[PDB]
Amino acid sequence: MLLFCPGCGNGLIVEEGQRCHRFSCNTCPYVHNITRKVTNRKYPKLKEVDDVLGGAAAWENVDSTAESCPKCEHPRAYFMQLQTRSADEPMTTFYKCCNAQCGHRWR
């Protein structure tokens, strides 16, 4: 990440001193000792998952005493939750029911 000197406002570089790593200016004496953990997270875009779960994938989220689906009122349906973008997104819930003479997709 860009961080800039309070004195002259040139761009800082990270270098190493005799006791700590420092943010340092190239044009003035200013240095800033890294005393504690500092971080910067990118969170890039993941792949699409839409065509990855279709067609009898290896899902696993089903559990004992799980709810029945609302149309058929039978537990013959899978349900899962996934991030669609990066993991800062709140996870979305989705479910699909597959029964005899009955095909549907629901949200």
* Residues placed in the known binding site for Zn(2+): 5, 8, 25, 28, 69, 72, 98, 102
What is the DSSP annotation of 53-79? HTTT-------TTPPPPTTT-SS-EEE
Backbone angles phi, psi at 12, to 5 degrees: -80, 150
Q: Is 51 in the site for other proteins (CB under 8 A)?
A: yes
By beta-carbon proximity to other proteins, the closer residue of 51 and 73 is 51
> Three-state SS for 80?
strand
Residues with Cβ within 8 Å of 93's Cβ and at least 6 positions away in sequence, in order, are 79, 80, 81
User: Which partner, Zn ion, other proteins, none, binds residue 50 by CB below 5 to 8 Å per kind?
Assistant: other proteins
Shortest separation between residue 62's beta carbon and other proteins, angstroms:
23
Interface positions with Zn ion (CB under 5 A)? 5, 7-8, 10, 25, 28, 30, 72, 97, 99, 102
